[PDB]
A paper describes a structure:
In this article we describe the crystal structure of TarS, an enzyme responsible for the glycosylation of wall teichoic acid polymers of the S. aureus cell wall, a process that has been shown to be specifically responsible for methicillin resistance in MRSA. TarS possesses a catalytic domain with a canonical GTA fold (one of two distinct A/B folds characteristic of nucleotide-sugar dependent glycosyltransferases) consisting of two closely associated α/β/α sandwich Rossmann motifs that abut and form a continuous central β-sheet. TarS possesses a D(91)XDD motif with aspartates coordinating a metal cation, a feature that is typical of the GTA superfamily. Altogether, TarS features a novel architecture with closely-associated trimerization domains connected by a linker region to three protruding catalytic domains that face away from each other.
Limited (thermolysin) proteolysis of the purified full-length TarS protein resulted in crystals diffracting to ~ 2.3 Å resolution, with SAD phasing using an iodide derivative revealing cleavage of the N-terminal region of the catalytic domain (1–216) and the structure of the TarS217-573 as described. Two C-terminally localized regions in the TarS217-573 structure (encapsulating the trimerization domain), designated here as C1 (353–495) and C2 (496–573), were also observed, where a series of β-sheets of unique sequence participate in an extensive trimerization interface (buried surface area: 6970 Å2, predicted as stable by PISA) and connect to a linker composed of 2 anti-parallel β-strands and an α-helix that leads into the catalytic domain. Furthermore, prominent basic grooves along the surface of the trimerization domain, and notably along the C1 domain leading into the active site, suggest that both C1 and C2 domains likely participate in polyRboP binding. Another interesting feature is the close proximity (4.0 Å) of methionines (M521 and M532) from each of the 3 different monomers at the bottom surface of the trimerization interface, forming a hexameric methionine cluster that we hypothesize may be involved in promoting plasticity/adaptability of TarS during multivalent interactions with substrates or potential cell-wall partners. Furthermore, structure-guided mutants aimed at disrupting the trimerization interface (M521R, M532R) resulted in the expression of insoluble protein aggregates. The overlap of the TarS1-349 and TarS217-573 structures with regard to the C-terminus of the catalytic domain and the linker region (217–349) further allowed us to superimpose these domains relative to each other and to the lower resolution full-length structure, providing us with essentially high-resolution views for the entire span of the TarS structure. Given the prominent electropositive charge distribution along the surface of the TarS C1 and C2 domains leading into the active site, it is likely that both CBM domains may be involved in polyRboP binding.
Numbering used by the authors:
A (entry chain A), B (entry chain A), C (entry chain A): 217 to 571
Amino acid sequence: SPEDFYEVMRLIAVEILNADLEEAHKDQILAEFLNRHFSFSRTNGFSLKVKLEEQPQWINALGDFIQAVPERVDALVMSKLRPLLHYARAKDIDNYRTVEESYRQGQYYRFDIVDGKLNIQFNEGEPYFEGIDIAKPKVKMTAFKFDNHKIVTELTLNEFMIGEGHYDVRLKLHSRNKKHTMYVPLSVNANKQYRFNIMLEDIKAYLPKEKIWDVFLEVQIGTEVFEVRVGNQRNKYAYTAETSALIHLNNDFYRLTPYFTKDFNNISLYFTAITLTDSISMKLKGKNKIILTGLDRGYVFEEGMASVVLKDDMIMGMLSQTSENEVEILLSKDIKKRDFKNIVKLNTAHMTYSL
Amino acid sequence: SPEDFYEVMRLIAVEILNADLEEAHKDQILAEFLNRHFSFSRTNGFSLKVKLEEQPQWINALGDFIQAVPERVDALVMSKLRPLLHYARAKDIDNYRTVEESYRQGQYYRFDIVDGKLNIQFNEGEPYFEGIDIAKPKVKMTAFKFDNHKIVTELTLNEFMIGEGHYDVRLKLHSRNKKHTMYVPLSVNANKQYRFNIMLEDIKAYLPKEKIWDVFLEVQIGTEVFEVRVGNQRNKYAYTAETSALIHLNNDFYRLTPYFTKDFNNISLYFTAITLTDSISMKLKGKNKIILTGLDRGYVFEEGMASVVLKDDMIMGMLSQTSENEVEILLSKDIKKRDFKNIVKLNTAHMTYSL
Amino acid sequence: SPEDFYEVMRLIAVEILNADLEEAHKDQILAEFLNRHFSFSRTNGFSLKVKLEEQPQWINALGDFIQAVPERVDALVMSKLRPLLHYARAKDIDNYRTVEESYRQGQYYRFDIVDGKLNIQFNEGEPYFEGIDIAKPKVKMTAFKFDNHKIVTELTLNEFMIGEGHYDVRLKLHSRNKKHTMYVPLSVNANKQYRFNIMLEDIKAYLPKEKIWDVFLEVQIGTEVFEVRVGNQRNKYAYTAETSALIHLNNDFYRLTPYFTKDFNNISLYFTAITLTDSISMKLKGKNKIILTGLDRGYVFEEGMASVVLKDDMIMGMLSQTSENEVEILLSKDIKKRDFKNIVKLNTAHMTYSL
């Protein structure tokens, strides 16, 4: 129960003050006490979790507890807590929730940035709290689709202390050895859902430099840069593990394989050479259907128009991903078995693969 | 005639000063007097409208009139008028026009921004006028084309007090209830003509959230943001009203319909469900042509390669928009009437529609 | 040899001081002396050119020479030399090289920008040198490919005093008369390799305004803009001179021709009208191959799916660039010679050309 709890934290704050050493050393010890308690106790975001009727009962005890700590100490504590300490002593939970609410989406009544920090007035007539640090945004990968033509991924900023439009975002590919880097511009965003089209024709020339490419979201605020590793929060990955995309580069074949890391479950891209006939079989089904089968893993191809090229003939077709390791190319006419063996080239809607 | 006119405005300025109340209250009343007169009288942009020979005759009378108002008052008047008041008293119309000229395109001899405001020196050797506010840009929609694959729109900033390169622009879709938002990056710009390619594959996932999407141009200068509603100034809209684009989304069909609002003639996008066979007929013409007819409104499709898919066969074709509600798909071979009834799938160059 | 050389420069610095005129006029004459010597002598970048063992022998003599010039003068010399003058007197070549190293890629131990200038601490514990100007980046065009559908060019910043991520870049097309302009956004970048996809459908409407379009790279740092003319440093151009791309615009045909200027060997784009049948021949080879031959210059087309349209029939094909002025369209079926003469329309994968 609230005031039985904050009763206790009040007395602990009292004894830190009546310990036996200097004045300013007690507040530093005390300042660390409420950085942690507001970060890791019941107090964090109580105005959004507790239902609205019981929260009046919460702010009284918090108020008497926060009344016990001197106003001096609000300068050494983490900057984003100064408003909550102030409305705690004032037992003002319309504004206390507003603040905790204001941090989640970055919607303040009035605000602006100064020196890369926030100055916020949370409601009309209330003071401005100045110099509030900007914490790292939480990112959830809410979509991830890919084929042999592009990768489409959606990253959703679930929590960020600053609203849409005042920051820039890019998708960052960082090699595991940190030596090489790729940046993909934003394609479109709907509120805080950020969608990136990674065209493999754009990144084919740079991928061979390293095998492991880790995915980050870069978020820039003027010149303060956040590097957010992405993947550990996500919607359910839509493919069987090791599902890959076929890449063709300087007469050689490669696979691009998304996967999730062992230590922290983040998403990365594995790029390595293959031998096409060891990885994918090509067979004739009926007289007008070509079937591509991933032998060890699924390969996803873009659906739509396709063609097969012989040395003196060509046939159009329609490609469809019938299963996660099986692709059907429905040809526009019959192909004899003897000529099927002489396919020189296979094309999807945007890519060509010389056999 | 000029000095008969500015004669009068001089005497009106004289009587505001000889009214009977405090000193600073007269200038505020006076400051509002010339905010309006420069905004809504013959004086606005006279150096660009009047032909060059008669303007010398204008600046003398303006000079004697502006000579009557104290230099004190140039601090409470709208910031962008301070240069014109100064060159008025100086009866300097080479610089007066230069200023009015300088505001139209944002081409100053010397300038830079400070606190989101302009500090301008209009000619060599002349003073710097500091702290000039930036008014909202005028936008004209100079192109708007669309099909079932993308929207291409060109927005031209006809007037803006700051030159190309120092601001950013994005295309904003804002739901009528302000709840949801889409931002499209700039695709290319030629001087102050800004072209946006809105790929429907990029926005298909976000459109179903609301029916009405209003079009804005966002213009950002550091952190000062302008929201400009667009459409009321435009070149002639190139389609018959209610012309739409067909969208396919999770087995369901929709229309995306550009239109212009009743109250202020701005352009918006209407997204709503349809029943394909109630809206579009598909018929065979001759033996090798498929005709799509919009029954209630025209539907625009991307011209170029297309195909029709049957359950065990496929046929390529060429799509052409023969009229605004009629589309022809010229097939590569004949199709029997009995098989035309068994078309399972229809594809344009970039989109697929399962029947 | 080092100290025989810097011996001399020391004495020259001595006599500039013992000349007969004012104090501050000698330092200005002296300040210009070491702007040039560090810019155009053995001293420039010696810590990166000389091999590591012999450089200790270099910094002693430089030290005694730089010891002779007063510390007063480091304020009037070019800002980026202040660290090297300081570590010269200190004969500190671990830090001297670090600085020269730090300028090449823009990798400082600690730094930030202030007023569009750098404040740098080069190693842990060392002072901060403040107010360092940012010189123009060196640009090398490391790739340039094009066809009738897009231009793909890669620009590599070989040297830039500021690391990736803190600046923006755009590709600029500037008409020779400076009247018209085109800006192409960045498509992707890998470290300091910046790739631009210039879609001709995006720039077709703006190209007719002028014939000569010069290529620049714009680099923006807050509001300080660099205009870097590109082309004179490049990898070997991949096409024969005058190789062009065919453009179709309002029933008329044009060529877009990259070329390099006479005076400074920079790359530009020439846009001018042609008569299709005077520039490109179309002939039948065998019964299923259409050959496009550039008569006066090569024309590059995008490889992949293509089609030819007759007034009541259409044929798909595969386009391949067999030589730099010869293109083969391998049709899906035979075409009679009498119907080949009645081709109304020719399509590549993304473009259409009405004959």
